[PDB]
């Protein structure tokens with residue numbers, strides 16, 4: 001009820017209000033362990049705020065705890081990466097991990113396997129720049145990732161599981177309406193609206209790809225023990241091989 | 243040229259470019275093993291790749307690209323494309339994947355390949371999503387073409403950014419064609435943007451499946467389960483698994 | 485599989 | 495080497 005009744009303007013307002021804060025990294029030269037340590041320490045702190053943001057994504061608290069857990073386990077790295085890309089928009093060639101950890105490609109990639117991932121993140125940021133992604137659009141896309149990523153991996157076949165998936169699809173349709181509204185407001189033609197909407201959603205394929213690759217890198221770091229993965233991080237990572 | 247095609251001429255071209263459904267070398271005299279099942283799927287995929295290359299050449303816009311960019315797009319998208327094909331052929335076979343007309347498998351059957359049943363379950367899920375949405379063939383050939391042009395686009399001196407722009411223009415035409423189909427089918431304007439979003443969000447799940455697919459295929463290659471053709475070894479190597 | 489469960493309730 | 499795919503793209 002609560003989320004299916006919001007106006008497009010109210011959806012956007014709710015999502016903007018629910019935005020998590022930008023976290024700082026730690027305050028000389030880097031190494032492989034010290035680099036991933038800052039990023040894993042960061043990610044870990046960002047995950048705690050993400051859960052609190054998810055609770056405020058309209059529709060999300062209507063779902064069972066099992067389902068909210070599954071959606072977050074599936075979506076979390078995609079959500080961290082879209083945030084990073086968003087943050088990095090105005091910094092061509094650099095990833096703004098935190099205001100005090102702005103990392104170039106030009107930075108001597110002390111982490112092995114990290115450059116291909118970095119490059120993909122940069123190209124996404126350049127894509128959002130080219131597109132002139134707006135903040136209101138970003139918050140819509142991030143909510144779509146949360147709701148979409150785990151939706152087809154609900155292998156449950158019952159009457160309580162179809163009513164639930166239909167609810168998540170109803171909420172997804174609303175976020176689509178909200179994106180279209182923003183574009184109409186901005187004065188885009190109907191043909192421009194549909195084209196832009198497609199453009200944005202095709203980026204989510206690329207974001208999924210980056211997460212899939214990122215996760216493999218993480219699992220292989222888990223197996224090294226050169227970095228201290230936190231307890232919550234071990235569990236989120238566990239869910240992708242489980 | 244692709245950009246001067248109408249919507250109807252785009253759909254006509256894509257339906258005409260459709261590759262045939264090929265038969266598996268399935269030998270019903272012997273039971274399946276892990277090696278024999280994987281041998282069947284890799285032999286099929288290898289024959290299907292040759293037709294795909296010839297289909298890609300008939301996708302409008304594709305032949306304007308340099309051979310290097312054509313190679314990259316196919317390397318990025320080949321498994322996504324095989325998978326969307328499979329899900330499409332399987333739509334009207336609930337619980338089963340129609341790899342070929344003589345190779346129609348349920349989830350129990352390929353439990354006999356280690357790590358395959360996870361992928362199988364995702365593919366069945368997708369086929370069910372398509373059935374539920376009542377995906378049409380004209381929509382399917384647009385989606386398959388979107389995968390070819392999109393999946394490798396963001397990983398592309400001065401010839402670079404006219405090549406990227408050409409691709410995005412052709413992709414915009416395929417969006418236009420999708421909306422046209424939906425309008426001609428009698429969908430309302432709101433239904434049109436909602437369905438466009440529903441279909442494009444499925445492409446994220448297809449990327450996901452392809453990524454999981456590629457890691458399984460790599461692990462099979464690395465346990466010497468099945469010999470891969472030189473073509474498959476190169477397509478697999480482009481994903482540079484580790 | 486439970487720390488997340490716990491954060492969601494908390 | 496010359497990739498197999500690059501060659502098939504010319505036939």
Ligand SMILES: COC(=O)C1=C(C(=O)OC)[C@@H]2O[C@H]1C(c1ccc(O)cc1)=C2c1ccc(O)cc1
Nearest residue numbers: 039040043080081084111113114117118214217
């Ligand atoms: C080799 O480099 C890679 O392991 C990664 C990323 C990439 O190097 O740039 C983002 C990225 O995905 C990972 C990563 C990350 C690294 C450690 C974690 O505990 C969680 C996430 C990343 C991360 C993403 C967003 C964020 O807010 C924090 C970390």
Ligand SMILES: COC(=O)C1=C(C(=O)OC)[C@@H]2O[C@H]1C(c1ccc(O)cc1)=C2c1ccc(O)cc1
Nearest residue numbers: 283284287324325328355358361362365455458
């Ligand atoms: C056996 O389980 C899995 O390793 C796979 C698939 C899945 O389990 O299908 C249910 C799928 O992705 C692979 C696969 C494939 C298997 C061997 C190959 O040389 C190439 C592709 C696949 C494939 C997909 C479509 C197609 O036309 C041919 C092969």
